Design a protein around this ligand. Sequence first.
Ligand SMILES: [Cl-]
Ligand SMILES: [Cl-]
Ligand SMILES: [Cl-]
Ligand SMILES: [Cl-]
Ligand SMILES: [Cl-]
Ligand SMILES: [Cl-]
Length: 129
Amino acid sequence: KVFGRCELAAAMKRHGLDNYRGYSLGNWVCAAKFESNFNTQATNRNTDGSTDYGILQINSRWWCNDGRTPGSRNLCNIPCSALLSSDITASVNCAKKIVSDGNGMNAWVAWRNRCKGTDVQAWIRGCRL
Ligand SMILES: [Cl-]
Ligand SMILES: [Cl-]
Ligand SMILES: [Cl-]
Ligand SMILES: [Cl-]
Ligand SMILES: [Cl-]
Ligand SMILES: [Cl-]
């Protein structure tokens, strides 16, 4: 599913991401924009042989099982395929664990390089939330 911007903002808000670990909704929408272009089916192979999955490009090295990432972990206890669903529940639940891991949203390199310190409220402008 390719979410619309305000459609994704609403879904994230309903699942309790707005201000989760102090990160406003615009931060999460901005991260999704640059990680996936709001496409739940996005996958990208990393140099280390792990893969990133879904709207927030969650990596198989630590967070989900894809059966092809050596000496990995599965800290969200989910198949990486669950991160590709039209329903963002698994992605959101796993993102909450990631952003609680100690470096906050810096875990998402694209958030740090493209969202951090920017006017992220622009990402929810116009939305009926
Ligand atoms: Cl915001
Ligand atoms: Cl990740
Ligand atoms: Cl694996
Ligand atoms: Cl699995
Ligand atoms: Cl959803
Ligand atoms: Cl933080």
